[PDB]
Design a binder for these strands. Sequence first.
DNA 1: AGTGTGAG
DNA 2: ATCTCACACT
Length: 420
Amino acid sequence: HMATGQDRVVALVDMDCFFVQVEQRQNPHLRNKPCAVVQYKSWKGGGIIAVSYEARAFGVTRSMWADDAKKLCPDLLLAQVRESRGKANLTKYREASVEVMEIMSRFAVIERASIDEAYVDLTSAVQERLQKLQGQPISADLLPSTYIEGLPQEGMRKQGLFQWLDSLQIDNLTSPDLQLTVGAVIVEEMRAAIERETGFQCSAGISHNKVLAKLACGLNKPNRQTLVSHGSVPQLFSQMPIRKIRSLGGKLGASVIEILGIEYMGELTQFTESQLQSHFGEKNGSWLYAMCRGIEHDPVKPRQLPKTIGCSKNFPGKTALATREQVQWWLLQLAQELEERLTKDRNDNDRVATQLVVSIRVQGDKRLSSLRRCCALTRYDAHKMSHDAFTVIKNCNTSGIQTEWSPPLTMLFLCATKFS
DNA sequence: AGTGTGAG
DNA sequence: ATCTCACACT
Ligand SMILES: Cc1cn([C@H]2C[C@H](O)[C@@H](COP(=O)(O)OP(=O)(O)OP(=O)(O)O)O2)c(=O)[nH]c1=O
Ligand SMILES: [Ca+2]
Ligand code: NI
């Protein structure tokens, strides 16, 4: 069933207001109440980074000062992420993420895609489950939080699910729609286990590829899951913004919109594959041709040890690193965080990083990074690493006066790679 | 390849 | 993210 890109069952799981839920687990009084998670900033109580769904009803959004949100939601409760060596401390979140990932790994192999989301390949689990119950159909009681995109044509959810279930093939075990339905069953079980063992809620999307799973996950949030079938793709794409498709959120997507004069994914269906290749190249033209028809093949890649570990910090405008002392201090601060993480990495995976990449951005440069250089990473010593990084970046101070740094630095980035 | 692009 | 990480590209 590859010709129609219905060969796999893929799901994407995304935690609802992840940081808020981890905080609600520590301090119970914040549960089922409007609350938020802020990064302490002296001005206005600090910026808000995670908002509960209860608080979103009052118009609360991320990137807005706590006091202004207070005005919008006076009952609003606050949780504050600790700050360390100029950045947020996410140990708590990484550990909760690991908990959930381990729980998901029991049902099918996963691909960790971020701190709060992961792809799941259920093809094998769907086959094995298909043999386990044959002939008896699938009752709606196994899909308490599943939405069937496009149907019908909390009450609506049940009516659409009934219309979906009444038409599912029963005997053809290779039926794409049946495989998706079973995948949604397994995801319902997965999420039930996750809640039971951690108290966390989440959403999921079930379809045939990563792109459709990602779109399906966001259709019915929170604490709900959405199944997007191949037959529902035309309707779903009829008004789906091109820039909302995974990998098309940047320049390529903008280019498609500008060159073809279209806004929705579904409009790409009218162009021929040769036209798309003549305008975007063989590879992107063919990819777009199949993607606008719901076909995509990026495989779900199991456990993978990260290829890099790094951290950085930006110093915009006034904050730009101007003296030599400042650059030395921030390099040391970054290296100390790096050391902490590299140490945990070596403890958990018995591998050591052999290369240190230093990257910096000078004030006034439009590029993301002004330059990058590499040196050996022999010892997990923040002090040593700080001096090595300084040595590769020292040439960049184009000023004979030792009293300052020129041009100033607006970004410092340290990264450990070449693991072995 | 080191840079640029993009997902989260 | 008003950061972490992956990887495509002669
Ligand atoms: C996108 C984003 C996320 N985060 C953090 C906090 C979030 O809890 C975590 C996951 O990010 P998101 O998944 O983007 O958002 P969310 O989990 O808070 O809520 P929902 O999925 O229901 O929309 O990463 C930021 O601090 N700044 C950001 O810009
Ligand atoms: Ca989330
Ligand atoms: Ni020293």
